[PDB]
Amino acid sequence: ANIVGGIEYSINNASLCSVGFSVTRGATKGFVTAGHCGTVNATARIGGAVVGTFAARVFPGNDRAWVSLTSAQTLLPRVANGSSFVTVRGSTEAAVGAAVCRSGRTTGYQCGTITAKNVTANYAEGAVRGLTQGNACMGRGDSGGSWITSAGQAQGVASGGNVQSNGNNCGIPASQRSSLFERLQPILSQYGLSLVTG
């Protein structure tokens, strides 16, 4: 399978999540995603084919994971934006006020701006601290997907937000949306990963 940020993957033939970013760890290929998407050793599938398993995760507290993939997967420095792509150029963290976009299997590619950093989400499983908040909308299934600047600077992977009855926060005004992401920096250092870029 071609690994691009934003596409859908299922976990243990059950839950759906989105790919964050293509990465490597020495000769091992992988992608980073959301910790709540799977437990260590859960099986990841893309289009019905097995592509890898969860190698590690942290959730709650933080919300992060990396899946190591088989050798046959093709890592790409890209994030899906409809039919086109956003090239990954690095991981410079943007500041409050910067515009940002995110891509996921549920709402597609949405952009907004970063409104706050170091936010705590009180999920039913326990708190998740240090999240950054943006007002791009997102829905159930978007978790783990890519947060990136139009310029290609990777920001993080989707964690969660304030959902309405329709399964997303796209029907509410930007001013009231709270879409949270886990910063990428700490996941790269924690797992010793390197981003695939182009």
Partner: peptide, 4 residues
């Protein structure tokens, strides 16, 4: 907030 809920996870996703």
């Amino acid at each position: 907030a809920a996870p996703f």
